[PDB]
Every structure is written in C-alpha cells, then in structure tokens.
Amino acid sequence: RKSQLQRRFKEFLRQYRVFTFKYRDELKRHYNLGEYWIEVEMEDLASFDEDLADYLYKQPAEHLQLLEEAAKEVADEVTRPRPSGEEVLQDIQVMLKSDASPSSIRSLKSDMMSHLVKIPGIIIAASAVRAKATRISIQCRSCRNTLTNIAMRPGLEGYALPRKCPLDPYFIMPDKCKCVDFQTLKLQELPDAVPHGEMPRHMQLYCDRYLCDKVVPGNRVTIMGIYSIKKFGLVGVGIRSSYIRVLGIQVDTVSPQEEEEFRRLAALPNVYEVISKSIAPSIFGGTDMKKAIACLLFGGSRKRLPDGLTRRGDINLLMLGDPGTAKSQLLKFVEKCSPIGVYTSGKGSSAAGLTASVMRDPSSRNFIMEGGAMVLADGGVVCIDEFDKMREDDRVAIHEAMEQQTISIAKAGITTTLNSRCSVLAAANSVFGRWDETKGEDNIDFMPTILSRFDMIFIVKDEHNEERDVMLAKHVITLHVSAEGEIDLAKLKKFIAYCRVKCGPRLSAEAAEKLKNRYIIMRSGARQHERDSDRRSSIPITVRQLEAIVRIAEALSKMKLQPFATEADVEEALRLFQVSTLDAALSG
Amino acid sequence: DVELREAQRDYLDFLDDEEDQGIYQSKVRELISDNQYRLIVNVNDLRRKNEKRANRLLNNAFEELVAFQRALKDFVASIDATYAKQYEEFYVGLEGSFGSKHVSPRTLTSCFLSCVVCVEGIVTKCSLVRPKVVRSVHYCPATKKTIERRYSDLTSVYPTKDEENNPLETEYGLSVYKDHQTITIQEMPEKAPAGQLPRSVDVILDDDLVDKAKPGDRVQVVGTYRCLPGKKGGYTSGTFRTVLIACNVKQMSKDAQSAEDIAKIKKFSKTRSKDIFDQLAKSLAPSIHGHDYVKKAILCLLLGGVERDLENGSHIRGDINILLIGDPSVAKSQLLRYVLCTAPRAIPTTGRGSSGVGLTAAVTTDQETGERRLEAGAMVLADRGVVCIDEFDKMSDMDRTAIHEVMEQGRVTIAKAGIHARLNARCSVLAAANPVYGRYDQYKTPMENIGLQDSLLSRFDLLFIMLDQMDPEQDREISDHVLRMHRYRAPGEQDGDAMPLQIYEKHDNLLHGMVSAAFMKKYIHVAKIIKPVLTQESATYIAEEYSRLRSQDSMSSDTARTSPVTARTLETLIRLATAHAKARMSKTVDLQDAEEAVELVQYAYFKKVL
DNA sequence: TTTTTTTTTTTTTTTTTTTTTTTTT
DNA sequence: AAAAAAAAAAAAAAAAAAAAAAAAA
C-alpha cells in the first residue's frame, strides 16, 4: 500500500549511511537553517531500495509526494523540539538529482509523458516569481460555511470550484489560502545538439517553492522533471500543450584549508615573483608587463572620504604595440583568470554592447537595462581589444566610467547612475600600424584627456632583433610540441578573489613622503621636457598619475596581505610607472 | 475575540505615552493639531516595548493593523472627541528597521504574504487617482426615503430601484468616496543584477497616499503583501495576483528636508558676521585642494540668488549657472560629484548620456487611452535643484541649444499637436568641460580655447578656467593634500580591511595637517530661505562696477574676456551678492557682499594671455 | 438554471511612416 | 554648411490567450 511505500522512503531517509547518515543530518541542518528543502541523490535511493527509484522513474507524480511526506515526517522526528511560535512543522520540497547522462530534447516523444526525464538546454527566458495556491479555502455565498484545506495539485493544473453547497455559491478568500513560489521558464535545445540544417526545439519548465530563481536566462542547464501537460478544465484536435515539471536543476559552465593555503602563499618572500611568472607562462618575455598586469588584477583600494567622495582603487592599463606581440592573447588570459572578467572589442562585442543602455518597453513601460561589458564586469576586469576604435557615445561613456566608476544615464523616463567598478585593460596598435620613431608621439591619436585615465601605458616594439626572434620561434614551437612555481588558473583566481575581498591596504608616512618627492621630480622633469620640445607630449603626467602610483603600491602590498604599503613596494611601483614614463619622456 | 481585544489593549497602552518619553502622545497631538488622520509609528518602538506585539504585527499585518487603528481612534477620542468624530477611521503607517521584511521587488517572494514589508524601489507606474465609493446615499422622489448603503473594503450591488420599484437617484454629494490609486514599483537598476530584466510589484494607495509618490522617483513603501482574487467563476487556476497594500509611502530623498540645531545655526551666524562665507567655502569640498574662488562660486550656487516676479508676471531667474573648463585632472568632476552628494535634488548627467528628449522633458502617447502624456525629463525633475552636467563639451549642439530657455528663464516649453505645456524647470546648471585640444593652450585666448559660441558662454554667469599649473610649490601642496587623503582611515571602524562591493568636526592631523558636512547642510538649507533686499549703496556700487566692467579700460593688454560682459553679468553680480548675503543671514545686501561678488566676477571674466 | 458564444482586456509583437541623426562633399 | 543615406521613435494594426458576462434554451 502507499503507506508501505512512504514507510520505506522514511527508512531510506533515516537509515541511509555513508560512517554518517547523510540525509538525516542534511534534514537537521536544512530545517535548522530554515531551508525546508533537500537534494536527494537518485543513485543513493536506487542503491538503498532500487524499487523506490524505479517507481519514481515510472510514476514520479505520486511517489514524489510520498517521498516529500516521508521527508517531512523524518524532519519532524529529527527536529521536533522548537521554540514557541515556530513549532508548526513545515513541508519540505524534495529536489532530486542523478548522474545519469541527460537525454536529448528530441527524444521527448509522447511515450515519455508523465515519466521522469533529464534533458539539457539553455534557458532563454524566466518569468517573475509569483503565487500559486497549495491550500485554498472556499466560502459559500449563501450559507457562509467554509470548506477549508482544499488540496491543490502542483504544476499547471487549475481547479474547479464545487457547484453544490444556490448553485456555484462558493468564493475564494485570499486571506486564508496558503500559496508558494511559482515560475515559468523557456528552455531551448543546446545549439551544439541542434542538427545542422534544423530549427532548435523548445520546452516550458515549471519551477516551484525553492526552484524559483535558481537560474537566470542564458544559463546552460540540466533539468530533471516530470513531462506533463496542462490540465485546465479540458486543425489540431485533442492537443494539450506539454511542459516539464522541474524537480532538479544543475547549472553547467572557500574552504578554510584554501584560506590557509592563500595565507601561506602570500607569506612567501618571492610571492610577487611567482605571481609575475604565473600569469602568461606560454607568452615569452614582457616580464614588466606581466608584473603590471598582476598589479592591475589585485587592484588598489577604493577610498570614500568623510565628505563622501570616492577614490577609485582599480588600476587601468593600456598597451600600445605592433600587431605582432601577444597582447590579445594576454587580454584573453586576463579575462580567463580574473575572478569577474569580460573580454570585448572597442565597438562592444557581438550583440553585447560595451556600456550599459536604458530603454523603456513601450508596452510594459518598464526601465529595461541592457547591460554592456562595463556593468556586467562590475567588481572585476574588462579587457578591451582594439581600444582605439570605440564609438563617440561609448568614448564619452568610458571617459566618465574609468574615473568615477559610474555610468550616468538619463533617458526620457528616469535618471540613474549604474555602478561600473571595473578595471580596464586596453590593447591597441599605433595609428599607422607599426610604431615608427621618426613620428614619435604622433603614433597615438588618443586625446590627452583619455590617456590621463590610464594608470600605466606600455609601449611594445619589434623593430629589430635576431636572437629574440630565434628564441621566440623556438619557444612557440616548443609550446606546440608539449601542449614548478606556477599557480594554476583556478587557484590563482581564488587567491585573487580572497585578497581583494579581505585585504585593503594604506600607505605609510615614509612611503607617502618618498612618493611625494619622486612625483615632484617627475612633474618638474616632464614640464622641462615639454618646454624643451616646445610642444605638449600627448602623454601627460597629472595628479591622476600620483593616484596610479599609489594604487600600484597598494596592490603590491595587498598581494602580501600586508595592511601597510612599505617603501620597497612604492619603489617597485615607481619602477613600473618608470617603464611607462619611458614612453612619457624618452618617446620624445 | 480575546486575541483581538488583547492586541487592541496592548496597542492602546503603547499609544498612552505619558509615563514614558511622551513621544507618541506628542505625535498624536501633532496629527490632531495639523488636521491629518494618519499616524506614522516606528516599528523599532514596538520592538523595544513589546517584541511579541511587533512580531505579531509584522507577521500578521491585516488584523493587527485593524486593532492598532481602532486603538488609535480610541486614543484620539480620549485626547479629543470633537476631532475624533470628524474622521470615520484613523489610519497608521509604519517605518524603522524591518529585519528580514526589508526587501526589493526581486526578493519579494510569496513567503511574505500577509506580512508587513518595507520595500525600496523605483516608481514606474502612477495611475490616475479615482474616487472609490465606500458609502452611497440614494434618494427616492416618490417615497421621500433616503437609503444609505455601506461598501466594505473587500480588496458590490449598487441600488437603483426601491423596494416597490421606485427609481432611486444617487446622492453624490452625500455619498462618501475615498481617493485611490495603483502604482507599479521596480527594483533600483543600481542594485538589480546587471543581466536579467527588472522585477517589479504593484502597490495600492488609499487616501492620504494617492499622490505621495510620482513616476520616476526612488521611494520606500511600507505595507501589507496579500493575494488578489479573480472574478466569480466555476473554475480557477491556482495562480493568484499579489499586491502591496501600502500603509506608508516615503520619498527616499531624506536629504530633501530641532531647537538645538536652530540655536547652533543662530549662534554661528551671529558670532562672526563677516567671514562665515569664506569659512564655509573653504570647507565646501575638504577632500579637494585649492580652487578657493571656484569653491566660493559653488557655495553661491548652493545658496542661489533670489527670484524676482514682477507685477507683469515677468520672471528673472534667481539661480546661478556655473561652467568649469579645466585641464585634465583638476578635480572638476570631483567637485561635480560632491555637489551631487550634498546638494538636494542634484540630478547627474553626462555629455551624450542624455540626448534631446531625455535631458529635457518629452511628450508621448499613453498608448492605452490614446491620450498624449508628458514625460519628466532629466532636468524638469531637477526643479528647485542642481543639474550636474559632466563632459559638457561633447554634447551635440542640438542638446546644448535645448537648454538655453531652462538655463535663462527656467521653464521648458514643449508642445506637440495634441498637447502643449511649459513645465517648471528652476534648476541651476553646473557644467564641467575639457577645453578644445584636450589641454588648455595658455598662448591662445580663452575665447578660442572654448569652442562654445558667445551666446552659451553668456548663459553661464560664471566661467572658471582651472589650469593645471605645475608650480613645484603648488604641486608639493597638492600632493601633500592628496597623499594625506589616500592615507586616511575611518576612525576605529576600520583596521586594515577593504571596502565591500557639531559645528566643527574633530581635527584629525591626517585630514587637516572646517565645519561638519551635516552642519553645513543644515545651515545652507536654513539660509536658502532668507530673502535679502538690495541696499542703495550696494546698488550704486554694483552699477559703477558693471559700468567699468563693460568699459574697455577694465581690461589691460594681453588680458582677454573669458566671456562677454552683457546685461546678464549685471544680474549675476546681484545674484552673487544676494548669495553672499544669504550666507550671513543678512536680510539686506550690504556693501561687503556686493564687493565680494564684484571681485569674484572680475576674477572670473578676465584671463591673462601669455 | 445551465450552457455557450461572444466580449473584452490585457500583452505582446509587427509594420509603415515619419522624424531624427550620422556621414559625406 | 548643406544634402544623402541610415537609424531610431513612435503610432497604428494584428495575433492571441485567457477570463467574464449576456443571450438562449
């Protein structure tokens, strides 16, 4: 009898071991945390009692109800003692997952209706969380009696009110009916699985209490659900639109041990060196550029003064060079390694603008914010290749954003200031294509204002060398043949995230003094050089460059988790800024 | 009902605030004295006095609010039955710290139904205000009988025939209606995840709240979240439509608006009646160094002059428009950011981020009624406020010429064939600019260093050139200020961690080597109300100064005008003088204000050409 | 009284025109 | 500075999916 099946589910939940009882303790912790849901591994259920799993696969509709009831009873048995005001037991949604490979959407024929089905896809739209009634109460209009606790079926299955206590005298009381979360999603077939000449198929997913908003459109998802049709008061004849009842969702693509690992990694005397050589090992040369990119990755510290003004702590880097150097490769690595990162071109990307835009839906009249690379990359890195080929609107937008960290947009509907706290890493080629010294300082068309934004500007050249060419060709061939001190991508990314979230340093008095004196000397030298050349170098030095040097020192000290930036790191930051002053001054 | 009686008794005991600090007794005296019938109660007080009552109110909003309102009506009757008899019901609004209920439209899940929620969001829809009847009165000419029928809040039959089929003529005047509106609120785009579409929620506003919030404003709505029913029908889908029955709507612009503070302001004004303006201006933007004249001028923008409305309805603007042309990295954008952070109703914008109909207001079709509707643009929203336009130069010239009227007469005239209007835009424009060629060529006249035509430069009353002179002493000072700022850490709250994604302030050595921002805000707000009157000697002084300013002799050799001197300049003087008077609570523009504004204008309107 | 066909309404999308904007001589 | 081509706005038309009410027997 169904009671026997529920009893067996209770035994499986209470006594499945692995020693430790996984599901009993999971119920304890979730109910104590208030989650009131669990994730049941299908294979464990099958192993403990294979008949239960087979029943689930053949008749999910009521067997999952039995499992949920059993889980509710077990949770009561494990967490019954509660303080007054919450002792009432809470139903438990039971999500189920399995390692079984998903079945292509094309195999969802009629026969699989009402069976548990696992399919892959890409969610292209998700509806807002809403209210569906699990328990409703109906009151007669004439006799004003009540029929409380009318069980409501899950899924897209409405309900018909009773006709006889007049006739059809009942109305629903909103204030007495219990409802839960609710959401509808559109799942498209993964483009890889779509046959060559063929449209992509679709399906409609229906979420539930805790499955709502577990995914957002664009996620690559694996869905385990109940293939079901709508049940709404009953040339195509007898066709009922079909949908999936979502039960398990898996979205495809820090432990204390790792925290201590990061702590010891930072404590290394040469942590800077190992990080420097651990970003683009495949790319040969450019040690200074790699050090600068590490500094950019770690970033400085954002400061908000008591007056409320904000000093950005994110470094902005620019790289002008011949089209031969591996700089787009460098940007690709940076976007692949930064915790939050996005690669894009000067003119945005493919159907993904650079800066955010705001438009009002003429029908729904909402304020839709189409996010560009900048807003999407908030708190991370935006790698802009071909940074010299922006569009005027985008040029102004980035002009504002790189300094203030905010994009201010005011449309016919509203004014607003989206927060884009992104570190910009820009790549570019000379105006002519190849850097020619004869027209030095004329190889850059950037207006002086923009060049002020970038903390550092690197200049790359390939004008002449034979030994370097031989070494480069042999190194590339060696890399293609093969295909220690290197922090792997995942470990490095997690270390970067931990350092950024945890440690924010500040300068020390002596460091500030040294940087002050050095900056004064740099300003004097730049002014004298500009006077001697009788022209303004299109690569100025401003107090913004002082902020850049301070930020680089802060990043160097943040690598080590040291709260204060010492004199040595300020000297190293000064050297890094000197490797760009080599373009500020030696260029002319 | 024992439970309801207990709830009402507890609420009435709370409202009976005489043994305690007498806060809510004073609030009831306030609501009765000023003739309003809705009370605002801080939930923190309920938590502090009775946690059980607060939890019950938050978790079961409807009946608890009914009991609270009935207790409120009883208490107001006790304090005064005459007023209490005037209003059928006394309503209640909530505010304070809502522990887990404080959410956004995105986070608003069905778990909060029948609870109290304090949501924050951007208003998207404000429907027309409709009178919803609550009590109808119908008069029968044949039977001379007047019949009253109540309409309970069931959020239906309207009688028309008497018992024996005598027509009933409704008595509109004697009928009782409550004004009612529905708005749609949305999660702030700032806090919404960058990827997915905005999530919104409905709100239903009864009387006292129908128009408390206007479209396109950031608001906080405290209310009850419940489910709406469908219409009568044999079949129903488990779906339910949920709304937020508001009990209070507040503008998040708390900056928009005690005896101790007023006394502080009075004493500060009277102490040194000579240099308060300079002391304030020096304290305007502490993080920034230098630019004393620019800070002074901005301090005049915050105060603003005085508007003149003649007998002929003529309008003379009393707001001050300022332009800051600067070489890169001279803190002009930082000053704009500070003005945004401090000045009330400070609308930001950028060169090409607000094109045409967005910067100014617009006109569209409702698309539902087929009726034309106005659209509050970026600047009409900034009425009686500041508009901070960064990257001013890069604007398309069409947008620039679309600002002259609002800049000068402060009203935007928009009319399409169906509709026409002259929206009020009394805003002061603070524009930032990068001079043509990026950097400022001192060996060129300021006229040709500015690509703007003569007329627009005339529009701006003050035009400040902020050069990036590198004088090694000045560079040393600026670096000292900046590095001291970058070293500053919050007092105690921070110890080496990172930022997550009184008349005089305490004198730190790392920020000083000034007046409080809050105190400055309060003093500026109170001073802004003052309306000084020009004095005869001041008028003569300003007239002579303007006469010389127009005269060629006022400019020596190799010094060029940063902007043409015309009639507007004269008004600027007055306005600036007026502003300087407001800083001292003068009530009379004496000679000191006039001469300070005069030197400010002289500094602004002439630049030495090398 | 009980069904049924219509009525609406409420969203959403689509197409034409006009207007506004951008690029070139 | 002015004209030519492109892009976007905006308004009107169509699909349509679903809930409610009036007329019919």
Ligand SMILES: Nc1ncnc2c1ncn2[C@@H]1O[C@H](COP(=O)(O)OP(=O)(O)O)[C@@H](O)[C@H]1O
């Ligand atoms: N120093 C280097 N080390 C390794 N590979 C390099 C190096 N320089 C260039 N390459 C190779 O040359 C190719 C060109 O690099 P790329 O970044 O595409 O240039 P650009 O950024 O100008 O487009 C890349 O595929 C890269 O693998």
Ligand SMILES: Nc1ncnc2c1ncn2[C@@H]1O[C@H](COP(=O)(O)OP(=O)(O)O)[C@@H](O)[C@H]1O
């Ligand atoms: N006189 C100054 N006093 C203090 N800080 C300054 C000064 N000049 C420049 N800065 C710093 O330089 C940065 C440049 O600010 P910003 O106004 O955004 O650039 P721009 O002036 O080119 O618009 C600011 O962060 C500011 O802290």
Ligand SMILES: [Mg+2]
């Ligand atoms: Mg490239």
Ligand SMILES: [Mg+2]
């Ligand atoms: Mg700026």
Ligand SMILES: [Zn+2]
């Ligand atoms: Zn009945």
